[PDB]
Amino acid sequence: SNLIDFYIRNGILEMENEQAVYPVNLRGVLNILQEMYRQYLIQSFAAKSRTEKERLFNNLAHLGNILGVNAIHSNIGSVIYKTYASQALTNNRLEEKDIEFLRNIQNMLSMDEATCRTLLQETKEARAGFLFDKIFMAEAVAEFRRVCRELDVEDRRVRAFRAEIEHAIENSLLKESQEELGISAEKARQVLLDCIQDRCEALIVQAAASLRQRRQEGAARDLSRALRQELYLVYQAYALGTARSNAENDQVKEDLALLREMLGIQAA
């Protein structure tokens, strides 16, 4: 039966490749017929010795003889034999290492230029992990824009800005615009109003929270005034007004006024 069939397999009757085969199966777990070809095939894609080169592909033949074109399937094969070991060199270790291992990979395979037809297909989405869930960080969400250009070269503007906001605030002005321009290197360059509606609803919390009880809203000012009750907080502007006047340096002179012109411009 499938019992005299496997007993026909008693024909192929390898121990090695046979065992290894079924072994590669029952284990990994399945068309008794299927893996049969499978394992064999990649076993052939191996190193030659004129007669093994023969028995193998020769029985590899008696195989198609079994199944008995569909042989495009021997392409769905290496396909993953690639994709796997492929994206294997995924997480940035591109090198001459990839270069190296890779080729040789497609070597013990068929694969015409199709290589690329995946080389990136992989490298491609290879990013779709990171820059997709760029949230779980922002320096990475940017790290995408870092390398997610290196290889591959919609609220995509949201993080773009958020990662631009958090990064910019923590973080010259116009060449850093080039850092926010790294964002225009992902999103449009006209979404400053999703930037402003994104950098405006931030200043507040500092106003609301710094402004609450004992000593200062001078801090929530220094950093929130790092942008570009009513007179009460205009006193933090008064507070540093003198507190800042901690040197009366040439600049201290100009940064104190316009700034105090901002809390003053952002009057109330």
Residue numbers in the entry: 903 to 931, 934 to 972, 978 to 1045, 1051 to 1067, 1077 to 1094, 1103 to 1159, 1179 to 1218
Publication excerpt:
Tic110 is an essential translocon component. Tic110 is therefore proposed to be the major channel for translocation of protein across the inner membrane. The second model also shows Tic110 with a membrane anchor composed of TM1 and TM2, but the rest of the protein is entirely soluble and localized in the stroma. Tic110 is thus proposed to function as a scaffold in the stroma for binding transit peptides emerging from the inner-membrane channel, and for recruiting/tethering other translocon components located in the stroma. To investigate the structure of Tic110, we cloned and expressed the Tic110 homologue from Cyanidioschyzon merolae 10D, herein named CmTic110, for structural studies.
